[PDB]
């Protein structure tokens, strides 16, 4: 299995100043991992639940 392109982008908290419990694929660990998204300025490697991160980045 190879993950799609967005699951390999670097985690980016972004430019705003709130918090939003999120998950990203740490593609060199092949795990979904929690992180706090700021609310804006992120990238495509972000998911609200861990399942969605597993569905898309692991093919689950």
UniProtKB/Swiss-Prot annotation:
Listed name of the protein: Kunitz-type serine protease inhibitor homolog calcicludine
Record-linked InterPro entries: Kunitz_BPTI, Kunitz_BPTI_sf, Prtase_inh_Kunz-CS, TFPI/VKTCI-like
Name the domain of life this protein comes from.
Answer: Eukaryota
Hey, what's the signal peptide range on this chain?
A: none
Q: Which tissues is this chain's protein expressed in?
A: Expressed by the venom gland.
Places the protein is found = Secreted
Q: Name one GO cellular component term.
A: extracellular space
Cross-referenced PROSITE patterns: BPTI_KUNITZ_1, BPTI_KUNITZ_2
Q: What is its main location?
A: secreted
Name the keywords, alphabetized.
Calcium channel impairing toxin, Cardiotoxin, Disulfide bond, Ion channel impairing toxin, Neurotoxin, Secreted, Toxin
Where do the BPTI/Kunitz inhibitor domain residues begin and end?
Answer: 7-57
């Amino acid at each position: 299995w190879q993950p799609p392109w967005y699951a390999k982008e670097p985690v980016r908290i972004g430019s705003c100043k709130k918090q939003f419990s999120s998950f990203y694929f740490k593609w060199t660990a092949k795990k979904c991992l929690p992180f706090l998204f700021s609310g804006c300025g992120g990238n495509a490697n972000r998911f609200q639940t861990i399942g969605e991160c597993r569905k898309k980045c692991l093919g689950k």
